[PDB]
């Protein structure tokens, strides 16, 4: 089955764009990354950075996750991110999202050897 690291990349990485280019970014990416296949994922963030730069966060500022786990890390630097959250009209299978561009620090949980992101905890 898909590894947790691989799921993070699929759900949260978009190294192919610098920022969201239109209001339909989230609608397209949520669909393309299969985040709307079974149900509308209600909120999701994409990170517009290289994979190596995001993986490197696992060596940055340790901080407890929202759920209290201690394997979370905050990036030293802000990153270009897109926040995707369901619109009030979103109704499976016609999932609809509001796209919000931001530059924020990210908080990720890390696991494994190599020690890499497996969960996107927050933008801050």
Curated annotation (Swiss-Prot):
Residues carrying a glycan: 1, 7, 34, 37, 41
Cysteines paired by S-S bonds: 26-84, 40-95, 58-110, 65-72
Tissue/organ expression: Pancreas.
GO BP: any one term: defense response to Gram-positive bacterium
GO CC, one annotated term: extracellular region
Localization: Secreted
Active site, per annotation: 12 (proton acceptor), 119 (proton donor)
Catalysed conversion reaction: an [RNA] containing cytidine + H2O = an [RNA]-3'-cytidine-3'-phosphate + a 5'-hydroxy-ribonucleotide-3'-[RNA]; an [RNA] containing uridine + H2O = an [RNA]-3'-uridine-3'-phosphate + a 5'-hydroxy-ribonucleotide-3'-[RNA]
Single GO MF descriptor: lyase activity
EC identifiers of the protein: 4.6.1.18
Keywords: Disulfide bond, Endonuclease, Glycation, Glycoprotein, Hydrolase, Lyase, Nuclease, Secreted, Signal
Keyword Lipid metabolism (UniProt): no
Family statement drawn from the similarity comment of this UniProt entry: Belongs to the pancreatic ribonuclease family.
Protein name: Ribonuclease pancreatic
Organism, as annotated: Bos taurus
Gene: RNASE1
Interval of the full protein contained in this chain: 27 to 150 of 150
């Amino acid at each position: 089955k898909e590894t947790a690291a691989a799921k993070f990349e699929r759900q949260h990485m978009d190294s192919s764009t610098s920022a969201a280019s239109s209001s339909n970014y989230c609608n397209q990416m949520m669909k393309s990354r299969n985040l709307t296949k079974d149900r509308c994922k209600p909120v999701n963030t994409f990170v517009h950075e290289s994979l190596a730069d995001v993986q490197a966060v696992c060596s940055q500022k340790n901080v407890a996750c929202k759920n209290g786990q201690t394997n979370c890390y905050q990036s030293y630097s802000t990153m270009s991110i897109t926040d995707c959250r369901e619109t009030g009209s979103s109704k499976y299978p016609n999932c609809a999202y509001k796209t919000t561009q931001a530059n924020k620090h990210i908080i990720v949980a890390c696991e494994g050897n190599p020690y890499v992101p497996v969960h996107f905890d927050a933008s801050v």
